């Protein structure tokens, strides 16, 4: 009876899915590889229909599965995890395992040189810097600039206001174009809209600022597993715990970069991560 391991179609889906598969095979659990099956909807239907067994899900996406998109509890990491875990077990008998501390949510990343020079690590620091007349040009989508949940919420909470001459506004939502603007300083860009663990952040020499007042919902990746399968292989829980523990924001960025910038296979990158940290 094979454990069917899967993931979402994106890079991180590939990386995390292979870490799970590698760890399972490494500890004598026979597996079926259905990694990168499709977007979140297809993968959810799959596990709830019993077609897959385990895959990496993000805490905050449970906001959308259980019709709680507008709830401010998802902006807290601990409460988001506890809620995702409780709901899925009660509703679906899906067990959420120990999460990664990485937060793959909408964020602002700065060029390292500007961050170092001005001691900017958090959005509180960034807001003070912008408010006080600091030099910034943010590359962002029109949706990020304008939708109430994004930059307007950052602006309100951290106490700054972006002038039109501090903004490069792009039509699309792909963070590839925004990361490259900041990386290459197009029209003096020095800051970029990103998702926390985008691979392009590592090689571009950017740093993600901490969302220290919790304005965006938290999307921490965790392995989630069908209960009947976990009952058969109960050691899966403890074996994935230390592994996901070690998957911080920068580590995740680098692994994703190895795949989406270096063109390495997700399988190889997963195994290299595991051997490097003594898990295989």
List the one residue out of 140, 126, 261, 121 whose CA is nearest residue 202. Answer: 261
User: Rounded CA gap, 222 and 36, in Å?
Assistant: 16
The DSSP result for the chain, as a single string, is --EEEEEESSHHHHHHHHHHHHHHHHTT--EEEEEEEESHHHHHHHHHTTS--EEEEEGGGHHHHTT-TT-GGGGSHHHHHHHHHHHHHHHH-EEE-PPPS---SEEEEEEHHHHHHHT--BHHHHHHHHHTT----EEEEHHHHHSTTSHHHHHHHHT----GGGEEEESS--HHHHHHHHHHTGGG--EEEEETT-TTHHHHTEEEPB-TT--SPP--EEEEEEHHHHHHSTTHHHHHHHHHHT--HHHHHHHHHHHHTT---HHHHHHHHHHHTT--
Q: Provide the 10 A C-beta neighbour count for residue 149.
A: 14
Technique behind this structure?
X-ray
Burial class (CB in 10 A: 0-12, 13-18, 19+), 96: buried
Which residue has 């020079």 as its token pair? 117
Domains recognised in the chain with CATH numbers: 1-104+219-280 (3.40.190.10), 105-218 (3.40.190.120)
Instruction: Name which of 190, 209, 194, 189 is nearest 124 in CA terms.
Output: 209
Could you tell me the resolution of this structure in angstroms?
2.3
């Amino acid at each position: 009876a094979q454990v069917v391991v899967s993931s979402k179609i994106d890079t991180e889906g590939g990386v995390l899915g292979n870490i799970i598969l590698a760890v399972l095979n490494q500890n004598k659990i026979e597996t079926t590889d259905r990694i990168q099956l499709g977007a979140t909807p297809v993968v959810r239907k799959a596990i709830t229909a019993g077609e897959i067994d385990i895959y990496p899900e993000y805490t905050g996406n449970a906001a959308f599965f259980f019709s709680k998109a507008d709830d401010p509890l998802w902006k807290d990491a601990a409460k988001g995890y506890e809620e995702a875990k409780t709901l899925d077990y009660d509703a679906n008998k899906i067990v959420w395992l120990a999460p990664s501390p990485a937060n793959n949510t909408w964020a602002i990343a700065l060029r390292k040189d500007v961050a170092d020079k001005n001691n900017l690590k958090t959005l509180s620091d960034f807001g003070k810097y912008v408010a006080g007349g600091g030099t910034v040009v943010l590359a962002a989508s029109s949706e990020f600039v304008n939708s109430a949940a994004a930059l307007p919420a950052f602006q309100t909470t951290y106490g700054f206001t972006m002038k039109p001459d501090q903004l490069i506004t792009l039509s699309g939502g792909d963070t590839a174009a925004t990361i490259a603007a900041a990386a290459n300083q197009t029209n003096n860009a020095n800051a970029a809209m990103v998702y926390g663990t985008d691979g392009g952040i590592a090689p571009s020499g950017l740093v993600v600022l901490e969302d220290d007042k919790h304005v965006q919902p938290v999307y921490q990746p965790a392995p989630i597993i069908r209960e009947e399968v976990l009952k058969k292989h109960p050691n899966i829980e403890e074996l994935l715990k230390p592994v996901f523990e070690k998957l911080d924001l920068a580590t995740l960025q680098d692994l994703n970069a190895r795949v989406q910038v270096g063109g390495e296979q997700a399988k190889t990158v997963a195994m290299d991560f595991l051997t490097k940290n003594g898990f295989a």
